[PDB]
# Entry
Amino acid sequence: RIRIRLKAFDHRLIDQATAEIVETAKRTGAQVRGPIPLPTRKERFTVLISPHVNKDARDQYEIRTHLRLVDIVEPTEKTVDALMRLDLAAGVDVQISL
Amino acid sequence: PRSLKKGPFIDLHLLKKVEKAVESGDKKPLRTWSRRSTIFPNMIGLTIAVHNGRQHVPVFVTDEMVGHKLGEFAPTRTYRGH
Amino acid sequence: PRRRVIGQRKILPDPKFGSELLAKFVNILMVDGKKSTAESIVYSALETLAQRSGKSELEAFEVALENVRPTVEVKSRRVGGSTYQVPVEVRPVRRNALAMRWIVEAARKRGDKSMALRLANELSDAAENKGTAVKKREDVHRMAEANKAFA
Amino acid sequence: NQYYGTGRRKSSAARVFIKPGNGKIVINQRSLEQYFGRETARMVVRQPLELVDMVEKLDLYITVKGGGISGQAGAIRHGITRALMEYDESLRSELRKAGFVTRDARQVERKKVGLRKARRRPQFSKR
Amino acid sequence: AKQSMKAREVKRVALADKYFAKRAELKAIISDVNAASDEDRWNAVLKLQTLPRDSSPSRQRNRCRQTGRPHGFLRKFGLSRIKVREAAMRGEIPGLKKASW
Amino acid sequence: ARIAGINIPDHKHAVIALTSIYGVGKTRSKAILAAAGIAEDVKISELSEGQIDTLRDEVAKFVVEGDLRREISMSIKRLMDLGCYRGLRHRRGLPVRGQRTKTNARTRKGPRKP
Amino acid sequence: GQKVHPNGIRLGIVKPWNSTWFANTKEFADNLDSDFKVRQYLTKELAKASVSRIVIERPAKSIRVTIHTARPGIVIGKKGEDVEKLRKVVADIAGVPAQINIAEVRKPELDAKLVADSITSQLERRVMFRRAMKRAVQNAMRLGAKGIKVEVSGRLGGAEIARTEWYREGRVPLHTLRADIDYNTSEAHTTYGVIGVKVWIFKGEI
RNA sequence: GGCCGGGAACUCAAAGGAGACUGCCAGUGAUAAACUGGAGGAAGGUGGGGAUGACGUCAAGUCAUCAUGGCCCUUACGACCAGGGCUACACACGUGCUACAAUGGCGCAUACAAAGAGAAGCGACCUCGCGAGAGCAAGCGGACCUCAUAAAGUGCGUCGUAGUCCGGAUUGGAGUCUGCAACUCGACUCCAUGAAGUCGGAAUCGCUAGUAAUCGUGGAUCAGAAUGCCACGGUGAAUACGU
RNA sequence: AGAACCUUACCUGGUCUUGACAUCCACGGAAGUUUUCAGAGAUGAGAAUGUGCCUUCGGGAACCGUGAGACAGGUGCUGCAU
Ligand SMILES: [Mg+2]
Ligand SMILES: [Mg+2]
Ligand SMILES: [Mg+2]
Ligand SMILES: [Mg+2]
Ligand SMILES: [Mg+2]
Ligand SMILES: [Mg+2]
Ligand SMILES: [Mg+2]
Ligand SMILES: [Mg+2]
Ligand SMILES: [Mg+2]
Ligand SMILES: [Mg+2]
Ligand SMILES: [Mg+2]
Ligand SMILES: [Mg+2]
Ligand SMILES: [Mg+2]
Ligand SMILES: [Mg+2]
Ligand SMILES: [Mg+2]
Ligand SMILES: [Mg+2]
Ligand SMILES: [Mg+2]
Ligand SMILES: [Mg+2]
Ligand SMILES: [Mg+2]
Ligand SMILES: [Mg+2]
# Structure
């Protein structure tokens, strides 16, 4: 029912937040389907590292957006309040739909 | 080129200038910098001086210079050979 | 190279005849990685050749290979001072390689109608010792034995 | 009962189920012929059964995806081998000796900065 | 990088988002199949060119937010490649590390 | 085989032979054939004079060799006499459509002079 | 001019990031420029408070700043007046509610930013660069560090030809990724120009 | 129609683990290091690729990213604007792209990818237009929707070796879109045109495998504007005697 | 990692000068919105509103415009001072 999509830049942080959410549930009520991995976005950038010329000297950086989906079904409505009012891990974006 | 659904292009300063000219005499060269403005049929007989970058080239407009822009008759680069 | 003993490529046998030699021929004739085109050409050419020869595709192919295949080749080299032509024997794998390469080059020359027909004509001319791949082998064998003094 | 083998080759992945049957070969709801127009790809797909027992003995239901024609043919051969090893495991040595069990893990090299296509260098000039 | 040119960029951004939604509706008129095709759609072509040129967003340049550099810009970060590399090495950019594959 | 004042070749398919008309390309050629009802894959020799003169009065709907040549000549002469930028480019024998002139423009320029 | 940034190369492995927040591409550059303004302001303010790090976090429309400093008493002041001044003048430029926390650096002699800052301050006060470098090296090695490298570059001692001088002591394995290498730079603006100091401090692996 | 119920097997996703260590066998070796084969193993000995660039060198490059000592200008070397220029063209060089064709061109039909991007953004479907596109307009901040038909390939015809049904420069005309604005000086489309070019002198470059070669795809920059750059997959070689 | 304008640093011409961009003073004052004319535009002239948690009526933050000077500004030079 309720879809919680978590995205972070660090997989350890997103896994800690996901465990946090799925054990915030299972205490207020059952019926959480479990976290789905979801493909990680790897956004790459390729910049020149010299201030002048040297075209072929480049640094290649990337940001890895990690993405989890919890998919908590049939809320207890003791769980919706527990899942909101939380902005934990300070670096994990949370989108709670339905 | 400029799409048909948008009409031709002319700057309003040049438009008003050529209106005033075609209403009140064909004497002075209309000094314009708008090389990007299409030459309209109500500009025939005028002697519009179009900026070429450093001078104003005099262009006596004919009815054959209609589907064109003013800049096509004020060449900007100077080349006499090598 | 300078350091390594080169391990050799595993080549699959020909899917139509199970002949790794024919697969190597398809590879010699392939351009731009167009292996389907190469094997189509060689299959049409071997059909035409087996028709013109009566014998098997592989048998006529081997006959042409024998007739264009070299035994000795010159090498611009030296023991010291000046680099002259030294005739060296050709090992069998290089014999097959040079035969197939000279046949493919001769067939790419002498434009007839298409590559299949040109390859068939070259293979027939080779089986009867009159193509330009045969002349390649002949002038190779004459460069050698003109440089027979060196060894 | 139903012997499975995955198989992967060059961006391609197969899923090969085999059963005791009478020669069925279906790839993505198509026969071997109407799926692989390439004689070489069909030869590859049939190699691991030509090696042991293909006359009719097995029915192959294969779902392959990713990669191109030869990639899918190689992934299919790998999956067939992996399934045959789950059915008369004693064929493992006979397969290994012909190959067919090695994953064949040679992938496309990534393009590298300053290079054209990961080894092609751009036309050096002295002066 | 020429405080004057950084000020030009500030002015252009302010002018563009000021005259927005007016330039937008004039362009909507000009792009409309309707509007008489001779009077409204023609006077809109003149109103648009009487609006200040710097109000057209096609005149902004996307300089680096720190150095005002017009080239080598990256929209994800808002900085030129040089400052992006500096911040990324200092760890200022979250999650951005050296990529290898 | 003598359409539009010229001598389009037989032993060629009709689409290919019609393109020999100055002013008829592939598209106009197949349009002419579709209006005349003639298969594109037939040779001009394999036609009957009714088919050929229907081809003639179908090509007649298009500006062709002499008409088109003089039309283009008047376009270029108009530009040159007007003295616009394109006219000056046509005069001096330089690219007209804003192409590179520093290194290339051999087609519009001729072979290298020195 | 050929070495990778140590912190940058170890950002994934052993060193942490200095900004800890997730943004989409929409507000990413905005958060980045806001962090730049915040760090610029805090550095210029606490230039005399021996600040080593400014960690930034954006938890749900707030801005949590964490000032790793060697003078926590000086950054806090009395009554918390200084931290509340900073919280106000940080929230103003961040556009969100601010929260300034302070982390005391127990060994300022083992902090590459504080060591480089001390060296550059000495160079501005015209202390001799060899003295400054050797002092920092010995201080770190005696306070306990498996290695330290100090490097100064520029018109050292006002010389007309710039040169690089560096002192190593112990181990500074730069190619080892698991190595905990605190690296940081600073620049002294002397009457002769800029002199660049960069300090590596090794503190063991894993 | 994975379309639905359903299953959690498989692919896949992405977290955590195992796995490769000369670990084992034999021989050689100074009884050493190591080397040579072999087994098993998905992989074999730094498995493949990347990142990682010692002390220094070239007073190499960058004062025009930035910062900065000094010097210099400060009713101007600062600042604003319009138009022009950076696109000039007797020439020379570098790097590319497309060709010279039949292992191909064209037409019809039909397979198989990967990796990405997307909110004044990507924009299905439907309608209109030969087309570029337009109108209307869902969906999508996304393993969901869109970009987005991969192409080479394969099958079937045709062309039949011609400067050609090769080549697609150039030029004329007619347009579309972006943008205040397409003349200088955009990209693209359609019609017409059909240039040089027949495989390139002395020379010279890259590459040891999924590499070269060839085929398409995406992205950054970006209103628009790549044959460049960065990335992705498809097909897929030849050869290494040796010094 | 993308010059039509912009970019842009160059040229011609039209302009400004404590200035396009900061801080500091005093003077008059809300910020904004619409609009007319002339001009290539820069810009120069002209027309109704508008009276904010600080009004202790003193004054005030914001945003202006105007004067004078510290200054600001420089993609000006030196990469052989860094
Ligand atoms: Mg995505
Ligand atoms: Mg290059
Ligand atoms: Mg490739
Ligand atoms: Mg722009
Ligand atoms: Mg700037
Ligand atoms: Mg024609
Ligand atoms: Mg120098
Ligand atoms: Mg220089
Ligand atoms: Mg000036
Ligand atoms: Mg200008
Ligand atoms: Mg210009
Ligand atoms: Mg240039
Ligand atoms: Mg053609
Ligand atoms: Mg021709
Ligand atoms: Mg010729
Ligand atoms: Mg090598
Ligand atoms: Mg070989
Ligand atoms: Mg001036
Ligand atoms: Mg130097
Ligand atoms: Mg330097």
Helices of chain B lie at 12-23. Residues 11, 13-14, 31-34, 36, 51-55 of chain B lie near RNA strand I (CB under 10 Å from a C1').
